[PDB]
Amino acid sequence: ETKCTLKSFTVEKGIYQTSNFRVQPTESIVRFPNITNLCPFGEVFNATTF
Amino acid sequence: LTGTGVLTESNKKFLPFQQFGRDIADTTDAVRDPQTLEILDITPCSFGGVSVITPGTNASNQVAVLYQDVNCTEVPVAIHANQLTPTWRVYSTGSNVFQTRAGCLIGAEHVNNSYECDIPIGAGICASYQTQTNSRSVASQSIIAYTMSLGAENSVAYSNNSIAIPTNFTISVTTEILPVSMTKTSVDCTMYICGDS
Amino acid sequence: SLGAENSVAYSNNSIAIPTNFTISVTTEILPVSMTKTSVDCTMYICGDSTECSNLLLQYGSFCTQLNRALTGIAVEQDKNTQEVFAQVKQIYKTPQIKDFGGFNFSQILPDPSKPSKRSFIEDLLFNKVTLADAGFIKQYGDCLGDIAARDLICAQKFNGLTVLPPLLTDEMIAQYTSALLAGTITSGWTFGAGAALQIPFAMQMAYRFNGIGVTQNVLYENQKLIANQFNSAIGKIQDSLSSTASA
Amino acid sequence: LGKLQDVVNQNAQALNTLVKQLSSNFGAISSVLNDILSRLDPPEAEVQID
Amino acid sequence: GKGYHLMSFPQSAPHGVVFLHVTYVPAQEKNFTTAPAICHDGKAHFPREGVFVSNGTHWFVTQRNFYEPQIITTDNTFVSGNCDVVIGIVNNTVYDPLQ
Numbered sequence: 001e002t003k004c005t006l007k008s009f010t011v012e013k014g015i016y017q018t019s020n021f022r023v024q025p026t027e028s029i030v031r032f033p034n035i036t037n038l039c040p041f042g043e044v045f046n047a048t049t050f
Numbered sequence: 051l052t053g054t055g056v057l058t059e060s061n062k063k064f065l066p067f068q069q070f071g072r073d074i075a076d077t078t079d080a081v082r083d084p085q086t087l088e089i090l091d092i093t094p095c096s097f098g099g100v101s102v103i104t105p106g107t108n109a110s111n112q113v114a115v116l117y118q119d120v121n122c123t124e125v126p127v128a129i130h131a132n133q134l135t136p137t138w139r140v141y142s143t144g145s146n147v148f149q150t151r152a153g154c155l156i157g158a159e160h161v162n163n164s165y166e167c168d169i170p171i172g173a174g175i176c177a178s179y180q181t182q183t184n185s186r187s188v189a190s191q192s193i194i195a196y197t198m199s200l201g202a203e204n205s206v207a208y209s210n211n212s213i214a215i216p217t218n219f220t221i222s223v224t225t226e227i228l229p230v231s232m233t234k235t236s237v238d239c240t241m242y243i244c245g246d247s
Numbered sequence: 248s249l250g251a252e253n254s255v256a257y258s259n260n261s262i263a264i265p266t267n268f269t270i271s272v273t274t275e276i277l278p279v280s281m282t283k284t285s286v287d288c289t290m291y292i293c294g295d296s297t298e299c300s301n302l303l304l305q306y307g308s309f310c311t312q313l314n315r316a317l318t319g320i321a322v323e324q325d326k327n328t329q330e331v332f333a334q335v336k337q338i339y340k341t342p343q344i345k346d347f348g349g350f351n352f353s354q355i356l357p358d359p360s361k362p363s364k365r366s367f368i369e370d371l372l373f374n375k376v377t378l379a380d381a382g383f384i385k386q387y388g389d390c391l392g393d394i395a396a397r398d399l400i401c402a403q404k405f406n407g408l409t410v411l412p413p414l415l416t417d418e419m420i421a422q423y424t425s426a427l428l429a430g431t432i433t434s435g436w437t438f439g440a441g442a443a444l445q446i447p448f449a450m451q452m453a454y455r456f457n458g459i460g461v462t463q464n465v466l467y468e469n470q471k472l473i474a475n476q477f478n479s480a481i482g483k484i485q486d487s488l489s490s491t492a493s494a
Numbered sequence: 495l496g497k498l499q500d501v502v503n504q505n506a507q508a509l510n511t512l513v514k515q516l517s518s519n520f521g522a523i524s525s526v527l528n529d530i531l532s533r534l535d536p537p538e539a540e541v542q543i544d
Numbered sequence: 545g546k547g548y549h550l551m552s553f554p555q556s557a558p559h560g561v562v563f564l565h566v567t568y569v570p571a572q573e574k575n576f577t578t579a580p581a582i583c584h585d586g587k588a589h590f591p592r593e594g595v596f597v598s599n600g601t602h603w604f605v606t607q608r609n610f611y612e613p614q615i616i617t618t619d620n621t622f623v624s625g626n627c628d629v630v631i632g633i634v635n636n637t638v639y640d641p642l643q
């Protein structure tokens with residue numbers, strides 16, 4: 001990570017404030033409300049007249 | 051509303067119609083779960099306080115880690131060691147659990163000596179790569195984290211009646227370097243930001 | 248108001264000579280360092296998102312020098328603190344016999360009563376300055392847990408805006424100040440050029456008077472009022488610093 | 495030699511950056527003026543050039 | 545330099561200068577007993593361009609930064625008022641030329 005945060009394969013003596021390269025998100029979650037109801041698209045787009 | 055982070059239960063107070071709450075500068079940090087109506091809290095999946103102390107690649111491969119302003123009890127919680135590689139988890143806990151006033155310093159052992167500072171670390175503490183391998187039995191050259199030597203202590207013996215006078219002087223020649231100029235440069239208008247076109 | 252007007256009365260033959268002097272102690276403050284800071288590359292300008300990470304990698308590699316510049320600044324600060332208080336490497340312990348003439352020096356010297364070696368005036372100056380930034384340790388646990396409303400320190404820490412601590416502890420600077428004080432009150436000014444050479448404080452005062460042009464027999468003929476004036480000046484400095492709270 | 499060397503290095507380093515930063519896309523499709531001029535017509539390549 | 549300054553020498557360097565400072569840097573200190581004044585014949589007899597330094601049962605005037613003992617003459621010291629004032633004055637015979 002120290003090599004990457006300053007972009008070099010050779011790192012000399014000292015202290016270095018590295019960037020964030022350790023943790024990568026691996027799981028995705030989705031939370032949507034309980035609706036389970038469709039629009040009247042068939043009652044609107046298939047109307048007798050507009 | 052999508053985003054990356056770490057969720058956690060929280061005691062935040064939300065208005066009945068409110069759905070999310072932002073940070074100081076337009077950063078949604080506490081969302082409300084729609085399926086349970088309970089309040090969650092989003093913390094960034096990034097803790098930037100990690101300072102790596104190295105003796106140089108062409109001197110060794112061991113390194114020390116300094117997490118900023120944390121105890122050595124929350125470091126696996128802070129950096130999420132459970133989601134990290136085993137090599138990183140080695141630098142999370144262990145035997146070298148030295149704690150300083152600028153976060154603790156897993157990776158390097160602490161000594162009671164007062165050697166002169168080699169690599170500054172934080173408030174008072176320094177570190178150095180020492181060839182203790184001969185001193186510490188069969189172990190290897192290692193990184194140590196001492197406290198700085200404040201020069202050397204001395205006594206004057208005032209005594210309220212005493213004069214001190216030199217008898218033999220020592221002419222000394224000292225070198226002091228000072229930069230007086232820097233390499234002047236010039237830049238072309240078009241040939242840099244447009245080349246030739 | 249252009250100050251106050253005054254007349255001198257030249258008269259072409261007239262000598263004005265003082266008869267009674269008034270030792271004065273004046274305070275002058277000087278900043279020697281500033282709070283070093285560091286900033287993370289992606290945490291600020293993309294938060295936490297892989298898509299913005301890709302777009303930043305494609306956009307450029309600016310931060311590679313930005314942090315560098317800030318890094319240099321940090322180093323500079325340390326050097327400043329290491330250049331003002333570390334003039335002499337030798338530490339001189341406070342004298343064990345407190346008979347520096349009529350001078351008392353009971354407030355400039357370190358105070359053994361307090362666990363910290365912060366003398367008296369140093370602690371008063373610590374209390375006068377209201378350090379409101381993230382100087383006190385704002386641990387990550389405070390930001391994560393036991394939180395009710397957002398504060399700016401947590402936002403700074405979360406957006407990568409970290410603040411490094413100074414290399415030298417305030418106790419360490421106190422030790423330097425105590426060493427320099429002991430050297431300048433016991434050895435005069437010899438330790439600034441060679442070793443510590445004992446000078447009785449009356450002899451040092453005579454040295455300094457001879458330096459400023461006023462020959463000896465002015466200190467020695469009457470030094471009790473000189474020490475009384477110095478003690479009164481120290482007391483006035485303490486009172487002004489503890490009352491005004493504006494210096 | 496210390497600081498006497500350092501300043502020189504600094505200057506050189508700055509110049510090197512001023513070259514190595516010519517490869518930054520800055521939001522354009524490609525950080526190569528010739529490639530944009532050869533791939534896109536003036537009216538559409540103008541925004542990338544700006 | 546560190547000690548008392550004597551002279552300096554400049555040397556050219558790449559985009560810079562190097563100063564060689566020559567300094568005194570006294571050493572080999574010895575600590576003796578001392579007094580601010582000697583009350584001789586009821587006179588303070590303060591030292592002039594020097595300090596009083598006493599060996600075993602002796603007294604001398606010497607320069608501040610070097611050990612150059614000298615006998616207590618009337619040219620090495622000057623008087624100023626009765627010595628009851630001086631605090632710590634050690635009385636001694638103040639030798640005199642012209643005698």
Ligand SMILES: *[C@@H]1O[C@H](CO)[C@@H](O[C@@H]2O[C@H](CO)[C@@H](O)[C@H](O)[C@H]2NC(C)=O)[C@H](O)[C@H]1NC(C)=O
Pocket residue numbers: 034084085086087
């Ligand atoms: C929304 O629907 C989910 C189911 O999809 C509900 O979750 C269930 O809650 C009951 C009671 O706590 C549990 O016994 C079930 O095991 C849960 N199932 C799942 C899959 O979560 C949720 O309570 C509903 N919320 C609202 C507000 O209606």
Ligand SMILES: *[C@@H]1O[C@H](CO)[C@@H](O[C@@H]2O[C@H](CO)[C@@H](O)[C@H](O)[C@H]2NC(C)=O)[C@H](O)[C@H]1NC(C)=O
Pocket residue numbers: 205206207573574575
């Ligand atoms: C100056 O005189 C003193 C008094 O005898 C010599 O001894 C020192 O006394 C002080 C105070 O008790 C101690 O702290 C020192 O440790 C003593 N000497 C040492 C260096 O051990 C002192 O040696 C004299 N200075 C000289 C000869 O340079």
Ligand SMILES: *[C@@H]1O[C@H](CO)[C@@H](O[C@@H]2O[C@H](CO)[C@@H](O)[C@H](O)[C@H]2NC(C)=O)[C@H](O)[C@H]1NC(C)=O
Pocket residue numbers: 254255256257258261
């Ligand atoms: C000697 O000092 C006295 C102090 O009063 C001088 O008198 C004052 O001089 C100033 C400047 O000319 C005037 O503004 C004051 O009004 C004077 N006051 C008095 C009381 O006379 C005096 O001038 C000085 N010596 C001389 C003669 O010049």
Ligand SMILES: *[C@@H]1O[C@H](CO)[C@@H](O[C@@H]2O[C@H](CO)[C@@H](O)[C@H](O)[C@H]2NC(C)=O)[C@H](O)[C@H]1NC(C)=O
Pocket residue numbers: 349350351353
């Ligand atoms: C020198 O300073 C010390 C500082 O403690 C003085 O001691 C204190 O004096 C006050 C009165 O002025 C007392 O109320 C305190 O109880 C004293 N404390 C101690 C620790 O002694 C001392 O009096 C001063 N001496 C002078 C005036 O030179």
Ligand SMILES: *[C@@H]1O[C@H](CO)[C@@H](O[C@@H]2O[C@H](CO)[C@@H](O)[C@H](O)[C@H]2NC(C)=O)[C@H](O)[C@H]1NC(C)=O
Pocket residue numbers: 266267268472475476
């Ligand atoms: C020089 O000034 C000082 C300061 O006022 C004089 O000392 C004062 O003398 C009076 C009368 O004895 C006292 O009431 C004050 O308390 C003293 N103050 C101090 C701080 O000493 C001194 O007498 C003056 N000397 C001359 C020659 O003018």
Ligand SMILES: *[C@@H]1O[C@H](CO)[C@@H](O[C@@H]2O[C@H](CO)[C@@H](O)[C@H](O)[C@H]2NC(C)=O)[C@H](O)[C@H]1NC(C)=O
Pocket residue numbers: 635636
């Ligand atoms: C040396 O100093 C001491 C202390 O002051 C002198 O002792 C007294 O001196 C006064 C003034 O000469 C006399 O009136 C007393 O009778 C002395 N008493 C003692 C204790 O002897 C001493 O006389 C001085 N001697 C020299 C060399 O002048």
Ligand SMILES: *[C@@H]1O[C@H](CO)[C@@H](O)[C@H](O)[C@H]1NC(C)=O
Pocket residue numbers: 108
């Ligand atoms: C590493 O150091 C050694 C000894 O100075 C040297 O011989 C070698 O060429 C160096 N290699 C690297 C990686 O710079």
Ligand SMILES: *[C@@H]1O[C@H](CO)[C@@H](O)[C@H](O)[C@H]1NC(C)=O
Pocket residue numbers: 160161162
């Ligand atoms: C220093 O010594 C103390 C006991 O005097 C001990 O408790 C501490 O662990 C030591 N620290 C080291 C060896 O780093």
Ligand SMILES: *[C@@H]1O[C@H](CO)[C@@H](O)[C@H](O)[C@H]1NC(C)=O
Pocket residue numbers: 120121123124386387388389
């Ligand atoms: C660290 O430990 C100290 C000592 O118990 C405590 O006061 C402080 O709150 C702790 N900080 C964290 C973040 O756990």
Ligand SMILES: *[C@@H]1O[C@H](CO)[C@@H](O)[C@H](O)[C@H]1NC(C)=O
Pocket residue numbers: 599600601602
């Ligand atoms: C004078 O000083 C020298 C050097 O310290 C010493 O050897 C000699 O005995 C002293 N003589 C006296 C007591 O005057």
Ligand SMILES: *[C@@H]1O[C@H](CO)[C@@H](O)[C@H](O)[C@H]1NC(C)=O
Pocket residue numbers: 210211346631632633
């Ligand atoms: C301290 O020195 C002064 C100098 O005048 C003297 O009067 C006093 O008696 C001395 N006291 C001690 C502690 O020897």
